[PDB]
Write a protein that binds this DNA or RNA. Structure first.
Lengths: 99, 111, 97, 76, 80, 98, 83, 109, 96
DNA sequence: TCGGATGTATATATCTGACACGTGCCTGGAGACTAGGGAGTAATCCCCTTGGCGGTTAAAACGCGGGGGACAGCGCGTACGTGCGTTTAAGCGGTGCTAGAGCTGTCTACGACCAATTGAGCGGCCTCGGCACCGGGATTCTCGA
DNA sequence: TCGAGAATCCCGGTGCCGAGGCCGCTCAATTGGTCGTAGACAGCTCTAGCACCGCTTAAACGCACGTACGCGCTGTCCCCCGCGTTTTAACCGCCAAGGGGATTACTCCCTAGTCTCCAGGCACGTGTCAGATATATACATCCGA
């Protein structure tokens, strides 16, 4: 019979592996395309240095990781294990970002 | 009329950071009309102390993992494990830093 | 070929590193991070001292303003040790000439 | 017991203390016999840095031990 | 140009896994995409304002750092 | 026989009344004594201006009101009506305070 | 004269009134001590900054301007008391 | 001979003092030199913002059938407008109070 | 034996108030609040303009610095209306 | 499903302290003129940005079985809200007194500014050792019986 | 409780590129001297902050009672997780063209500095009405029935 792990083991393994390392997690080209499309609205025919795109990517990733940590704490506070959109909304509301 | 050999102002105070550069930056930085003769020495000493402390901690972290060079991960580990330094750099992100290895206790496997 | 000079704190940071840990190198990214850290702290302290001097309607920046700004910015133990180091440095500079 | 401590200058010096001797009195005696201030130096035994309030009995340092001595240059 | 769809589901999963999450519901992805869009909008608006004032045509790495610092989100190691 | 209100009515009445007004809630003299005792630890034989005490009281009251609002939101999020210390702890943790 | 045991001057009904203004409806019996601790910490921070400010000026009377500056330094600016 | 004096504020058609703003800019340690166009711009911006806040506060005061303006009216005016609330998000107003809201769950059945 | 002079923004605030609502007064505490508000906004704008001038290796602050600082600080509609008012005022001043 | 008791909103007299206004005057703002350096503008150089083409291989997309977690319903007992009688000190109105904030002179030591000059720090080259990579074996776990 | 598979770590050999050090030189920090004024010190005047004493009454305290809500337990259903197969586009390498960033020289004009003059804004004093209290009454709302 095929050997299967119980649901939950691979999640913890991925947690350990991914917070042991220090690389980026989003593919570079789609992020660059998104940045260009977002900036197109404000001014036409713009140009970007590579280091600017790198800095934007790093800042966005750090922000998202911190927000996800806060969301996990909010989810645990209510005797649950799965995160849900209401947890994200509550975290953003308490942080003072959402009006 | 024989001018004496020049001696750096940093050497008189027994420091390593440049006193004269800091004095010029203070004068040209639009902070006040005039700048006293004792502020640059104080500023240089303070900056030197902070740099030495952070470097010592980061070097210890690097030696821990059997390496002879310092990389941004070692700086992040050094900063985030000390409460006072963590308080100082509360709202600062370091590139290529990562995060501390923690897991919530409830999520751990039962039995 | 004409190139503009750029100033940095690299050599002094390397001197301090060799002073505390005799056998340890450093890469370029860490040096850039340290440069940014030094510049940021310098700006914070200088701005606080300037505001403090402006409050008391005085037109000079002395060591007293720097001491008060350092005591205001840093946490406890760091403030104590930094104040001690600064006072020692000023005394040593004044004694020699 | 007797210990041998090598410095950054490549020189090794003998040292006579007891297992329960804390690093404070050992540093004071080394200062007496060499003139080196206690707070200017720091020692490694087996890749571990000593603690001033600790001794060699808990640190497991015995006779004919090899310790590494490294300068901590600080002051004004 | 639906480039917002370039943020694949496994990438969001990896970010959450580094954040410390063990189980993820099925509707997190839309919220994550919206939040990321808002953040990028604000930062890029500030950076483009700086670049336009400087009388240039290409954004630099410096004004990105300036815009990030303006919002109390200082960044180290990019020539700041 | 005596007329009694069911548990909950007076709470809402007080909510409305205290959200309609603006006056201070903590008494003056106990707050002044607390401020003096706290400040004693930094420099002996200090003196205060009355406006300083008033400013401290206003700032502290505003801070406490905001904290209680966030605490109530946290308590509501977990299917409860009564607030508990862990709600205060979670709100303070998320806000970014040690 | 040395003062002692003044944290108990913040009575339970005062905390209840503050919570009522905040919008709470039911309060557990363990809130009051936690509220006292939080208020104590906040006051310690603000008073420390104000006393430093008044010390630099070689004075001996804490003025409202010192409190205003100390509050502003922490991003909690206050309007209506000058400056 | 000499001509009669006219204020710069009168020339610009404003109600805020241009000369005082110019002096404060010069003496505030902001830059080495100050141009001749900055004070007019700054005075205009300040006047516009003051007029906006005052109009909203006066409307709120007239709502409560009163002839004068007290800090509560200013707080009500500021907190009920989105952009003004965002501009003053970290500012507390003395004698202000709060906005009368109650969560829907706590209401009786 | 008279006291020293304390500057304030009293007359101008009162003039604007009478311009908007002609039949409405104001009390003292609200007046102090408005004074503090004006000072705070002035300081914020001036500091932003000074930093912007410093970044570009320039040694003077002109109307362009003020305009860019206003655009950076304020939210959208307030920024647009303030920009329009400022440019109109500057043009009217230069014309005469 | 109605009806009595309680709290809250509405209308009127009245008296007090704060707001609005009139004066004198003195210091800050305006008019007129010079002189000098910061900034606008044109021309030139070349570095870095954009755009295109081929492959290759790892990563993303899709389908499926199933076990574990989210959620609704029930029962219990205890902590909290409401009301009443008793105790405590906060608040207000005076009377004293002095420590210290605030303003004025004056006088000297400290910082800005200038000309000559020489050594610290930056840009360009290069060489080699520390770290990245690949293959293999020992070890440490997890899940079913 | 015990043992068969997977995933991870320790070890050894190999090669590459950037980190550490050396030269040459140009600009900025030193040294020596003068001059003007910012602030430190002494003296004086007057305010408001601290201390005390008495009285009134409103708020804090303690107790009894009942009830609605926090929390544990059970059952069900469905929806994410782990795995295998197919598809796709990201990444790397290489090659071309040229737009716009970065210097350098030249010149006109915008702003700081000075002197004279005068009127706008601030401290001071005075009056009167907007609103805060007190009293009475009408109306909305809640809890048993």
């Amino acid at each position: 019979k095929p050997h299967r792990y119980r649901p939950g083991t691979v999640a913890l393994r991925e947690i350990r592996r991914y917070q042991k390392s220090t690389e980026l997690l989003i593919r570079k080209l789609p992020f660059q395309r998104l940045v260009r499309e977002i900036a197109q609205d404000f001014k036409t025919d713009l140009r970007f240095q590579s280091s600017a795109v790198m800095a934007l990517q790093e800042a966005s990733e750090a922000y998202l990781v911190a927000l996800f940590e806060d969301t996990n704490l909010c989810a645990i506070h209510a005797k649950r294990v799965t995160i849900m959109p209401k947890d994200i909304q509550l975290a953003r509301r308490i942080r003072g970002e959402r009006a | 009329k024989t001018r004496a050999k020049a001696k750096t102002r940093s050497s008189r105070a027994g420091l390593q950071f440049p006193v004269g550069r800091v004095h010029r930056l203070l004068r040209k930085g639009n902070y006040a009309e005039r700048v006293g003769a004792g502020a640059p020495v104080y500023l240089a000493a303070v900056l030197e102390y902070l740099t030495a402390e952070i470097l010592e901690l980061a070097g210890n972290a690097a030696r821990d993992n059997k390496k002879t060079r310092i990389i941004p991960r070692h700086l992040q580990l050094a900063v985030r494990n000390d409460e006072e330094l963590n308080k100082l750099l509360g709202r600062v992100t370091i590139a290529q830093g990562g995060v501390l290895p923690n897991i919530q206790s409830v999520l751990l496997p039962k039995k | 070929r004409r190139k503009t000079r750029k100033e940095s704190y690299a050599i002094y940071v390397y001197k301090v590193l060799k002073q505390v840990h005799p056998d340890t190198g450093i890469s370029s990214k860490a040096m850039s991070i340290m440069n940014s850290f030094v510049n940021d702290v310098f700006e914070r302290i200088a701005g606080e001292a300037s505001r403090l001097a402006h409050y008391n309607k005085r037109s000079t920046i002395t060591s007293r303003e720097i001491q008060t700004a350092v005591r205001l910015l840093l946490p406890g133990e760091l403030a104590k040790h930094a104040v001690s180091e600064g006072t020692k440095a000023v005394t040593c500079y004044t004694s020699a000439k | 017991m007797q210990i041998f401590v090598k410095t950054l200058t490549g020189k090794t010096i003998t040292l006579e203390v007891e297992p329960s001797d804390t690093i404070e009195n050992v540093k004071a005696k080394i200062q007496d016999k060499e003139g080196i201030p206690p707070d200017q130096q720091r020692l490694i035994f087996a890749g571990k840095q000593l603690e001033d309030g600790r001794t060699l009995s808990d640190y497991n340092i015995q006779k004919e031990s090899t310790l590494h001595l490294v300068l901590r240059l600080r002051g004004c | 140009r639906d480039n917002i769809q370039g943020i694949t589901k496994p990438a969001i999963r990896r970010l959450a896994r580094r954040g410390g999450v063990k189980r993820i519901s099925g509707l997190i992805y839309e919220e994550t995409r919206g939040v990321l869009k808002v953040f990028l909008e604000n930062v890029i608006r500030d950076a483009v304002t700086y670049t336009e004032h400087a009388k240039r045509k290409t954004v630099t790495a410096m004004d990105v750092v300036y815009a990030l610092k303006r919002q109390g989100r200082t960044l180290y190691g990019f020539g700041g």
